[PDB]
Amino acid sequence: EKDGAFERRFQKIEVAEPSVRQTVAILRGLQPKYEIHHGVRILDSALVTAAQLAKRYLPYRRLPDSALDLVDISCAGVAV
Amino acid sequence: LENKALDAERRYDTATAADLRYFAIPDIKKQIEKLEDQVAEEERRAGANSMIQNVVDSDTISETAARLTGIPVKKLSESE
Amino acid sequence: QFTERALTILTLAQKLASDHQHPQLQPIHILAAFIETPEDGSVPYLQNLIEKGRYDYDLFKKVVNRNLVRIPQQQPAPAEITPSYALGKVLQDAAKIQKQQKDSFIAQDHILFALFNDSSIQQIFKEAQVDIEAIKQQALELRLSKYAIDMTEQARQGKLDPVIGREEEIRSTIRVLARRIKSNPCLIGEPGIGKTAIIEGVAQRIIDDDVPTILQGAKLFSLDLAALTAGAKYKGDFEERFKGVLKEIEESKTLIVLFIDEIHMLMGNGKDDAANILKPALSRGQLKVIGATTNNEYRSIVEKDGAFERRFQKIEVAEPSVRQTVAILRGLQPKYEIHHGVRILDSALVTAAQLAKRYLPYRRLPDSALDLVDISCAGVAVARDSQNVVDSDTISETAARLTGIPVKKLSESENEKLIHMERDLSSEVVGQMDAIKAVSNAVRLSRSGLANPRQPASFLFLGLSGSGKTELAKKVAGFLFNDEDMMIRVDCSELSEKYAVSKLLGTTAGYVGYDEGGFLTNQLQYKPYSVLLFDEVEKAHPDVLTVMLQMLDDGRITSGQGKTIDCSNCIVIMTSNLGAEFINSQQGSKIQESTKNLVMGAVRQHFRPEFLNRISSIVIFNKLSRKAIHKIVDIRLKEIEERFEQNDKHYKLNLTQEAKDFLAKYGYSDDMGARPLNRLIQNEILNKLALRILKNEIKDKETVNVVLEECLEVLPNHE
Ligand SMILES: Nc1ncnc2c1ncn2[C@@H]1O[C@H](COP(=O)(O)OP(=O)(O)OP(=O)(O)O)[C@@H](O)[C@H]1O
Ligand SMILES: Nc1ncnc2c1ncn2[C@@H]1O[C@H](COP(=O)(O)OP(=O)(O)OP(=O)(O)O)[C@@H](O)[C@H]1O
DSSP states (O other), rough: OEEEEEEEEOOOOOOOOOOOOHHHHHHHHHHHHHHHHOOOOOOOHHHHHHHHHHHOOOTTHHHHHHHHOOOOHHHHHHHH | OHHHHHHHHHHHHHHHHHHHHIIIIHHHHHHHHHHHHSSOHHHHHTSSTTTTTOOIIIIIIIIHHHHHHOOGGGGGGOOO | OHHHHHHHHHHHHHHHHTTTOOOSSOOHHHHHHHOOOTTTOOTTTTTTTTTTTTHHHHHHHHHHHHHHSSOOOOOOOTSSSSOOHHHHHHHHHHHHHHHHEEEESSSSHHHHHHHHOOOOOTTTOOOOOOOHHHHHHHHHHHTTTTEEEEHHHHHHOOOOOOSSSHHHHHHHHHHHHHHHHEEEEEEOTTSSSSHHHHHHHHHHHHHHTSOOOOTTTTTEEEEEEEEIIIISSSSTHHHHHHHHHHHOOOSSOOEEEEESOGGGOBBTBBTTTTTTHHHHOOOOOOOEEEEEEEEHHHHHHTTTSSGGTTTTTEEEEEOOOOHHHHHHHHHHHHHHHHHOOOOOOOHHHHHHHHHHHOOOOSSSSSHHHHHHHHHHHHHHHHHHHHHBBBBTHHHHHHHHHHHHGGGGGGOTTIIIIIIIIHHHHHHHHHHHHHHHHHHHHHHHHHTOOOOTOOOOEEEEEOOOTTSSHHHHHHHHHHHHHOOOTTSEEOSSSSSSSSSSSSTTTTTOOTSSOOOIIIIIIIHHHHHSEEEEEETTGGGGHHHHHHHTTTHHSOOOOOOOTOOBOOOTTTTEEEEEEETHHHHHSSSTTTTOTHHHHHHHHHHHHHHHHHHTOOOOOEEOOOOOOHHHHHHHHHHHHHHHHSSSOSSSBBBBOOOOOHHHHHHEEEEEHHHTHHHHHHHIIIIIIHHHHHOOOTTOOOOOOEEEEEEEOOOEEEEEEEE
């Protein structure tokens, strides 16, 4: 509204929150980065769980990140 | 190794990518598998390696989500 | 290749040889050009590289005049035979100098240099060293390209996109420039209209000789910003660069026209005469300047200034019509075909312009059209790996790729994609297909390009609680948007007299909040197409039901910040239980004649006719009778199992006829609808399940059954 220039100089791309299934795929893609950083192992069901829990319990933080918070935090819990 | 192989592919040095895509990368994969077998349960204990908590979907993550949001449902406690 | 100054000096060398009746051109003749005039301002003669460098200009003057006298008088026919290798070399060396100096054009100084570098006095009567460094020093200290781009030269070199229609504002521009006092036209209007395009159009008129001489010879430049500020470090150096340029354009070189695209770049900072003012200050000395600004920027600066207003002519620039827009697309068509190496159909240019209007309320026709064309061409350029731009499919697809607008998908599997909505939605929504048809009809009209562009489809769903009014809206959001929750259900019943910004009404600037209609207006703005539903419209305060008239007809949506969305490509669902008093008469599961009039009667007595008149159709949904809920119970149980996270165990769902019947008879009433069914399944089936789960005894699979009421099994695998 305040601009009216940049507004016209780029393509608006809406970025939707990924589905829970996509989120799990993300979590799986990142699984080794968590395991390597933390020096821990995780379950595949853990990845599934984080995506689902985030969908259910963190409605102010979108999935990818919310689920990853659960993963990272969980891994940190274990690392400690 | 995958990053190196991938770099070789983007460098158009595919032959050196092959040096890793074949043999080395799957060897490390197999080393990982062998290590998991070493970690795996023994007749004397539920997992050879006790410290690995294997970030458990419930015991670690549904628990973590509860540590962050309370959401007592995900405690899944025997106290029911 | 050469500046006008360099061409003048060389030309004079040639013509002086003609005037002096001299054969082959010599270094002497270029030196003659140097001393061609008494004007001190001529660097080649008095304010020289020689005179302010190392030697008396007279020394050189006499070298040349002695030599000019010395060369014998020829027949006029050979008087200037050829530059030969001698002047060829000087001009070539001037080019070598450009390369060394990184100069885009040959300067008269490069000619002075190159000639001097090659030359030597040919006779004992005068002597002087070619003091190369002195002549360079003096050249470097003398004489806009440092601060601006020569738009005219770029145009001479092509690098320009032709215009259509805007010729009239160009003619106005020329007419203003031709003025003796207020010589500065300014292009004012919406972004994307073509104001830059106009200034290029001006460059074309200069290039094409369509301009009266007093403007015809003008050199048009792209000014400031970088030169203005990037070139700045300290107080006053803006004014220095300004003054420098202004002086340059004030004299000698016929005329130079400066162009300022974004005038907002000036106006100082709260004025304070923070440099900007120098231009207005000197503006009386003709200083032909063309400027431009967004109408709202104009506003934000005209309101503050008043000074520049007496220097410039305000010119509104009109937006071209769709057909005119097509003409620009046609004019630029070859630019686009060249840009990407693709062909484009004329019909594509046409559909792009028309469709673009329909598509983009936030783009002017020339942007929206050029966007579809350049985007499509770019899309095709990717497809170059396989193509060309298609009027129908390419335009439809790139528009849809970017805005979704599924109406343009025109899928090859139309059987599912709309034709069988009656079957697909009946499966999801059990009940009269007519409710379903009302929606599918609207949808089909939107896909076929038939839906009236001035009326977002809208329906009023009359029913009982538990009827599935919302359910239908969600299921069509499911079918159509691939997301049942994409839709915005609206709390219109929760609406008193304050009902502004939390609702579509938005909020007024100057009052707290510059964020408005979040739930509705902003999301409606954000989503290129959508589903909007109003919950219990009969309970809403009538003032908003009145506001709704704005988009119930037209589809037009305007916010408290005055912004417009116009979602005529969306579907709207209004719901009410207002007619429930007559629906509850039970006169047919689907309400029959006369009774339906009483159902609608309540609607007609309650709502202003105006509300009602703008609804595509008012629909009464049949009570979902017990024989029908039979299906939803089985369906619902399927959905229930599917909603339970990961499918690790889950039911075999052996309701047996007894639980099918218990659910049908206990969880349903003609006066409560289907709602109690969900409550019942959960109250008994899921609660008992929860007990088996609670105990953490279930090992694998779950079973539904009865005790002769509803009752679950326990597995032989647990306690
Ligand atoms: N006659 C025309 N009308 C509109 N656009 C044109 C025309 N001819 C060429 N164009 C192209 O369309 C675009 C018009 O953009 P222009 O810069 O004039 O918009 P604007 O009015 O300057 O607003 P802005 O400041 O967002 O550029 C240019 O990119 C130009 O190449
Ligand atoms: N036609 C149907 N097909 C399948 N399920 C249905 C149908 N109608 C109702 N249901 C069930 O009942 C509920 C649908 O009710 P809905 O959300 O439309 O409430 P409603 O009819 O708008 O009443 P309200 O006005 O009190 O919100 C859902 O939970 C759904 O399981």
